[PDB]
Design a protein around this motif. Structure first.
Motif, PDB file in Angstrom:
ATOM      1  N   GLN A   1      47.815  22.827  46.216  1.00 23.88           N
ATOM      2  CA  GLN A   1      47.953  23.535  45.016  1.00 23.88           C
ATOM      3  C   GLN A   1      46.626  23.913  44.542  1.00 23.88           C
ATOM      4  O   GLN A   1      46.538  25.214  44.310  1.00 23.88           O
ATOM      5  CB  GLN A   1      48.620  22.697  43.923  1.00 23.88           C
ATOM      6  N   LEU A   2      45.257  23.365  44.654  1.00 25.04           N
ATOM      7  CA  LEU A   2      44.146  23.834  44.256  1.00 25.04           C
ATOM      8  C   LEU A   2      43.514  25.230  45.143  1.00 25.04           C
ATOM      9  O   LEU A   2      43.139  26.026  44.762  1.00 25.04           O
ATOM     10  CB  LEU A   2      43.044  22.987  43.992  1.00 25.04           C
TER      11      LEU A   2
ATOM     12  N   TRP B   1      44.663  28.405  43.962  1.00 31.25           N
ATOM     13  CA  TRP B   1      43.681  28.758  42.555  1.00 31.25           C
ATOM     14  C   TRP B   1      42.367  29.261  42.958  1.00 31.25           C
ATOM     15  O   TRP B   1      41.740  30.201  42.548  1.00 31.25           O
ATOM     16  CB  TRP B   1      43.842  27.930  41.634  1.00 31.25           C
TER      17      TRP B   1
ATOM     18  N   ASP C   1      51.424  33.902  41.379  1.00 30.81           N
ATOM     19  CA  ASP C   1      51.004  33.599  39.753  1.00 30.81           C
ATOM     20  C   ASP C   1      49.555  33.008  39.553  1.00 30.81           C
ATOM     21  O   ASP C   1      48.857  33.624  38.661  1.00 30.81           O
ATOM     22  CB  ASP C   1      51.724  32.179  39.632  1.00 30.81           C
TER      23      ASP C   1
ATOM     24  N   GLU D   1      47.834  36.689  39.887  1.00 33.88           N
ATOM     25  CA  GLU D   1      48.035  37.238  38.454  1.00 33.88           C
ATOM     26  C   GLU D   1      47.424  36.707  37.503  1.00 33.88           C
ATOM     27  O   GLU D   1      46.650  37.595  36.639  1.00 33.88           O
ATOM     28  CB  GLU D   1      49.639  37.231  38.389  1.00 33.88           C
ATOM     29  N   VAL D   2      47.300  35.754  37.178  1.00 37.24           N
ATOM     30  CA  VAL D   2      46.534  35.055  36.145  1.00 37.24           C
ATOM     31  C   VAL D   2      44.967  35.411  36.213  1.00 37.24           C
ATOM     32  O   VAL D   2      44.267  35.708  35.352  1.00 37.24           O
ATOM     33  CB  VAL D   2      46.700  33.502  36.404  1.00 37.24           C
ATOM     34  N   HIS D   3      44.391  35.210  37.607  1.00 45.15           N
ATOM     35  CA  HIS D   3      43.060  35.319  37.694  1.00 45.15           C
ATOM     36  C   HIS D   3      42.707  36.850  37.441  1.00 45.15           C
ATOM     37  O   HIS D   3      41.457  37.229  37.374  1.00 45.15           O
ATOM     38  CB  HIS D   3      42.258  34.878  39.024  1.00 45.15           C
TER      39      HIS D   3
ATOM     40  N   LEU E   1      43.945  38.890  35.260  1.00 48.44           N
ATOM     41  CA  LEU E   1      44.310  39.296  33.992  1.00 48.44           C
ATOM     42  C   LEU E   1      43.227  40.289  33.408  1.00 48.44           C
ATOM     43  O   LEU E   1      43.612  41.241  32.848  1.00 48.44           O
ATOM     44  CB  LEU E   1      44.472  38.040  33.024  1.00 48.44           C
ATOM     45  N   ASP E   2      41.914  40.193  33.795  1.00 47.39           N
ATOM     46  CA  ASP E   2      41.136  41.117  33.523  1.00 47.39           C
ATOM     47  C   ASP E   2      41.193  42.723  34.055  1.00 47.39           C
ATOM     48  O   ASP E   2      40.668  43.556  33.516  1.00 47.39           O
ATOM     49  CB  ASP E   2      39.762  40.509  33.880  1.00 47.39           C
TER      50      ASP E   2
END
Lengths: 237, 300
Positions: free
Chosen positions: A75-76, A79, A110, A113-115, A117-118
């Motif tokens: 999982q990591l 990210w 996901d 998309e989260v990283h 956001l900028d």
């Protein structure tokens, strides 16, 4: 939306876009412990960020040290990919940042998309193509720099060598993926085919032999033949 | 006990008061609802016999004034209005009682159901979500869209619910991207509870109001809002024990009250399996879990 054979030629238009392949970010071997339990040992890995139009590849080497004292490492890994992909965009000048990033595995959607956001105007997109980028570590020179690294490191390549001097991105990307597909399904033969003739060499600044036009055709045909053989073997057809 | 008189009942209509409802025939002599318990919010609502689309209705609280209903033939619907003339109002209410044309708010005395569905719902907050501050009461219907739904058209008619979005800057602290997105405690506790709602009762009030709007008007965006507020909690590793306990009571009576036949559109399969079985809070909703398994095992 998602990327499939319908909207395939989009890869080659003039909108900057990157592919992100995360399959080789977290790489283990599985072995038995003295007590006879199983344990994993991680090896160095990499992210496979690729501009299908230009050949530019942003090989981000992932050093085993990054896993030290962490849990849920698969999982990591997702990210860490998205964290590295994001810092790559930020590092690039604006006119060079991509307008779309295509992830080869929907589980990256996901975290990217989260990283990102900028970067709301950068579209993160999945694909339904079955791309062979995992076979990237079958390319001797990419596996070599990954395995030698002693620290995090970014190494830049053109994955098309000098092909674009004579063929279109479309054709380049099909030669790439034929080759990688062949390397995936039967590495030993694929690499036999590429290197049998000692008189066709790999320039020091290149990844693949310096085949002539006529020789690429023979290669491409051998690769095709390989891949169709392996299918029959897999399915008894 | 309070009263909501009706001037007339010109058109066939099903009238709802809180969780109770009655059929009223065209120009049947119906003049209102009596014995409504003071102390809670209430919602009187409507579905015309001719148009099963658009359920509509008015949230109100009797302490805030004397309210009644009057059909409006230009606009074609039952309108709530306020009588400022106290004497003229008690005058009308008394005479319709004497004539006995009013139904009685049919409360069983063992029943806390409506209290439990509305415990944290306060009218002052209702009027901030439904902004129309010339009226003490608040109109909602099936088709009103929410502020979030408008972002993705007329803001006078919008449900200004608090905007919750798991993939936003608000919800995700830079550098804790992974942490905040697998464990929403930051978003729930600092951003939403301490930041915007100020306290859990205001959070729970919005959640409960969203649920009722979904249930009584099938308002699709209200349904989305409830699920969002449930999700945020269930996806937070660190929640005050008292919130977890009240939530478990809250959802229980919501699940309990829901029409059995509507469990297909009012209950989001993913959110609920995540809350009850995947989230941090899987083991914290014992009443909700038990009631959901015995009533809607299929959704799970």
């Amino acid at each position: 939306g998602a990327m499939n054979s319908s909207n395939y030629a989009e890869l080659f238009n003039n909108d900057i876009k990157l592919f992100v392949d995360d399959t080789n970010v977290y790489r283990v071997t599985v072995h038995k412990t003295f007590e006879g339990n199983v344990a994993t040992k991680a090896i160095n890995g990499c992210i496979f960020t690729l501009n299908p139009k230009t050949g530019h590849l942003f090989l981000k080497i992932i050093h085993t040290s990054v896993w030290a004292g962490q849990k849920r490492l698969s999982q990591l890994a997702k990210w860490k990919t998205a964290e590295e992909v994001s810092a790559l965009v930020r590092s690039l000048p604006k006119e060079e940042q991509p307008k779309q990033i295509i992830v080869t595995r929907k589980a990256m959607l996901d975290p990217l998309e989260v990283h990102m956001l900028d970067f709301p105007n950068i579209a993160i997109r999945p694909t339904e193509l079955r791309l062979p980028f995992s076979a990237a570590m079958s390319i001797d020179k990419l596996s070599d720099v990954v395995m030698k690294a002693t620290e995090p490191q970014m190494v830049l390549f053109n994955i098309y060598d000098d092909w674009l001097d004579r063929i279109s991105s479309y054709t380049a990307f099909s030669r790439l993926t034929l080759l990688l597909r062949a390397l995936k399904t039967n590495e030993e033969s694929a690499k036999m085919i590429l290197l049998s003739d000692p008189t066709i060499t790999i320039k020091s600044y290149h990844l693949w032999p310096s085949f002539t036009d006529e020789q690429w055709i023979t290669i491409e045909s051998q690769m095709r033949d390989l891949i169709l053989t392996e299918y029959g073997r897999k399915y008894n057809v | 006990m309070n009263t909501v008189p009706f001037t007339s009942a010109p058109i066939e209509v099903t009238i709802g008061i809180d969780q109770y409802s009655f059929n009223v025939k065209e120009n049947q002599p119906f003049h209102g609802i009596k014995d409504i318990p003071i102390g809670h919010v209430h919602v009187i609502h409507f579905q015309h016999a001719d148009n099963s689309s658009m359920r509509y209705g008015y949230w109100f609280d009797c302490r805030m004034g004397n309210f009644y209903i009057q059909y409006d033939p230009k606009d074609g619907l039952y309108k709530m209005m306020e009588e400022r003339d106290g004497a003229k109002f008690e005058n009308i209410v008394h005479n319709f009682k004497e004539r006995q044309m009013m139904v009685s708010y049919p409360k069983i005395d063992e029943d806390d159901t409506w209290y439990n569905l509305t415990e944290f719902v306060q009218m002052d907050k209702i009027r901030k979500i439904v902004r129309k501050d010339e009226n003490q009461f608040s109109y909602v219907d099936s088709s009103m869209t929410t502020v979030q739904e408008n972002e993705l058209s007329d803001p006078a008619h919008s449900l200004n619910y608090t905007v919750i979005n798991f993939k936003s800057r608000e919800a995700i602290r830079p550098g804790h991207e992974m942490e905040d997105f697998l464990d929403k405690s930051y978003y729930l506790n600092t951003v939403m509870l301490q930041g915007i709602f100020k306290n859990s009762s205001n959070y729970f009030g919005e959640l409960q109001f969203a649920f009722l709007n979904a249930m009584f008007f099938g308002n699709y965006g209200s349904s989305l809002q409830w699920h969002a507020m449930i999700e945020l909690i269930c996806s937070s590793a660190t929640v005050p024990k008292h919130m977890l306990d009240k939530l478990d009571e809250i959802l229980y009576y919501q699940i309990k009250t829901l029409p059995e036949q509507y469990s297909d559109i009012l209950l989001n399969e993913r959110v609920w399996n995540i809350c009850l079985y995947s989230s941090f809070q899987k083991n914290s909703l014992h009443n909700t879990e038990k009631i959901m398994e015995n009533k809607y095992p299929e959704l799970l």
